[PDB]
Write a protein that binds this ligand. Structure first.
Ligand SMILES: COc1ccc2c3c1Oc1ccc(OCc4ccccn4)cc1C=C3N(C)C2=O
Length: 123
């Protein structure tokens, strides 16, 4: 396994916005409870999961556990930066797998819910 993505970075400027607070309190914490959230709650453990090719294919890994800790640490400058991490997590799943795979069906459902929730953000 590679090191998991950073959740803090002292030379990166931090910020807290109403939209970033909403991304943690509403968007992430609601998605987290979905029946299909479990594969996305932690970095992929390629040793545990017997996926020795995972990080040969996926070069920008991302997961909701990382995103959660980034939000908690005020790691992001703005909501768009956090949204990009969700999108990277979903696209990684489509890249590493195949259409119709169980894990892909899960990501597709979570992505739809994610889009529903970010359609309207606080001002
Ligand atoms: C062949 O299996 C796959 C195949 C592809 C993918 C994955 C697979 O498997 C997982 C198994 C477990 C797991 O986590 C187990 C767990 C997590 C939380 C609570 C309880 N149990 C996460 C994943 C995440 C995956 N992602 C992102 C994939 O693209």
């Amino acid at each position: 396994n590679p090191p998991p993505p950073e959740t803090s970075n002292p030379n990166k400027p931090k910020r807290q916005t109403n939209q970033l607070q909403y991304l943690l309190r509403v968007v992430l914490k609601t998605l987290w409870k979905h029946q299909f959230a479990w594969p996305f709650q932690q970095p992929v453990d390629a040793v545990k999961l017997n996926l020795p090719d995972y990080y040969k294919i996926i070069k920008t890994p991302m997961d909701m556990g990382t995103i959660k800790k980034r939000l908690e640490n005020n790691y992001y400058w703005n909501a768009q930066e956090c949204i990009q991490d969700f999108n990277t997590m979903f696209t990684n799943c489509y890249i590493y797998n195949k259409p119709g795979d169980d894990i892909v069906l899960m990501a597709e459902a979570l992505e739809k819910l994610f889009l529903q929730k970010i359609n309207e953000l606080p001002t």
